[PDB]
Design an enzyme around this catalytic site. Sequence first.
Site, mmCIF file in Angstrom:
data_model
loop_
_atom_site.group_PDB
_atom_site.id
_atom_site.type_symbol
_atom_site.label_atom_id
_atom_site.label_comp_id
_atom_site.label_asym_id
_atom_site.label_seq_id
_atom_site.Cartn_x
_atom_site.Cartn_y
_atom_site.Cartn_z
ATOM 1 N NE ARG A 48 22.900 26.733 -20.559
ATOM 2 C CZ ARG A 48 23.767 27.708 -20.440
ATOM 3 N NH1 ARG A 48 24.812 27.758 -21.227
ATOM 4 N NH2 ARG A 48 23.589 28.631 -19.531
ATOM 5 C CG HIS A 52 19.365 30.203 -18.846
ATOM 6 N ND1 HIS A 52 20.070 30.625 -17.730
ATOM 7 C CD2 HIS A 52 19.719 28.890 -19.033
ATOM 8 C CE1 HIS A 52 20.801 29.584 -17.291
ATOM 9 N NE2 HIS A 52 20.624 28.501 -18.051
ATOM 10 C CD1 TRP A 191 23.635 15.274 -18.375
ATOM 11 C CD2 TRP A 191 23.552 16.659 -20.145
ATOM 12 N NE1 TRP A 191 23.808 16.577 -17.951
ATOM 13 C CE2 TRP A 191 23.763 17.466 -19.003
ATOM 14 C CE3 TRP A 191 23.458 17.292 -21.398
ATOM 15 C CZ2 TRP A 191 23.881 18.849 -19.104
ATOM 16 C CZ3 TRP A 191 23.576 18.682 -21.498
ATOM 17 C CH2 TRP A 191 23.786 19.456 -20.355
#
EC number: 1.11.1.5
Lengths: 294, 103
Positions: A48, A52, A191
């Site tokens: 992540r 970003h 998820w």
Amino acid sequence: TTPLVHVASVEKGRSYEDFQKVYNAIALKLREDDEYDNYIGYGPVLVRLAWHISGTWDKHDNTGGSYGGTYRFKKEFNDPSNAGLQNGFKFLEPIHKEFPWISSGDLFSLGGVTAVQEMQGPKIPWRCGRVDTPEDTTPDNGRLPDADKDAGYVRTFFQRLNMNDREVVALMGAHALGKTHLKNSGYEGPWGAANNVFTNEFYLNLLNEDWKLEKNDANNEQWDSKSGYMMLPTDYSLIQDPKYLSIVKEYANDQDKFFKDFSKAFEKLLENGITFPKDAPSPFIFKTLEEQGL
Amino acid sequence: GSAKKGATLFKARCLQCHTVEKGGPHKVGPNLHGIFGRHSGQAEGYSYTDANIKKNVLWDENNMSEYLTNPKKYIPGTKMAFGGLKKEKDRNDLITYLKKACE
Ligand code: HEC
Ligand code: HEM
């Protein structure tokens, strides 16, 4: 004037081996601090962070992007869609002190490459040369995606990064990793079940689970499956778009394929905006700890 | 090892697919209740793969420690994906909590 030009410049006489060492440090430390986030590890958060720092790119004027390692400036560091990444920043400051020659941009991306490979994802060719840029190159907050949207905001948000439908569906499979944290973002849950190993679970879950939309405690709505998983609006939107949905089915069926598109995309993501002279070295393929006896 | 550190290690890395309650529901994986003494691929109410039923190996406290370090290297063609415990203090604390909860 045309956009800015960002030439990748190799760190003064460094080479693969100098870079396989950085990987090893990062890699090991992922092996060492394994208690993070209820034992998910630092895997998901480093991938992540990689995304970003790269996702601010704007192909129209070529600003933002991995090149400048500008996430290190408060403006960027403090962007609210960046909540929770401080945990990823800290995890590599140590390693940075160890190798102060590598640029910030080269560290944040190498890190996501390590995490994917270390979690058993595919190999991701990678290149060096990012160069650090003054506090002035710091992108204003707000170039990153909202979760609360649909297929069409997604398709368009991505044309700005220069990605197509297949690349956008492949990238999203990264949602197999980690989970959402309500204190970070208003959403909560994972998820899937293998949050720290890279597979195509993301897509089988999307299509085999039974999703119901509901509100969390942060007061936002999300899709929850009976099995304990959640899907953000933007993820669900992938099966409501006829076109996103056939790529999702491909991938649920064939991991190799997913594995091949993802690697092509992830790297494309990390190199956006950067010009490599014709004299730079071919992209590197690093070895895992497993491949090195560890 | 200790049973207090093994209770937070199973409720974090595993538990989302397996369960330690007697007669629990099957989410993504089979039940681990009564795994010490049974062969691989004997849990009823769940579909196993062709690589987990052909191995057929008794799960003891010495052969189960090698499966935790690498689930894809010990059994080639497994479906449950898992990074793998690489520390000796994390494999000794998870096996002590799996022997008292799964009786
Ligand atoms: C899904 C994401 C799972 C996670 C996380 C864990 N396990 Fe797993 N396990 C899962 C499946 C779907 C299966 C069957 C695989 C198949 O190929 O059929 C398994 C199997 C096991 C076994 C073997 C059971 C037997 O042979 O009867 C063991 C010993 C086991 N799993 C243990 C285990 C541990 C200790 C976990 C965390 C560390 C773990 N599993 C995670 C699904 C999933
Ligand atoms: C439409 C675009 C996207 C949106 C709206 C989005 C949104 C989110 C949100 C809200 C979270 C949880 C934040 C938290 O609580 O910490 C998250 C986590 C994460 N995102 Fe995405 N995402 C997008 C695309 C991507 C892409 C393209 C990748 C990667 C290549 C990615 C990788 C991840 C990972 C790995 C996590 C888990 C982090 C952790 O476990 O800490 N995301 N995403």
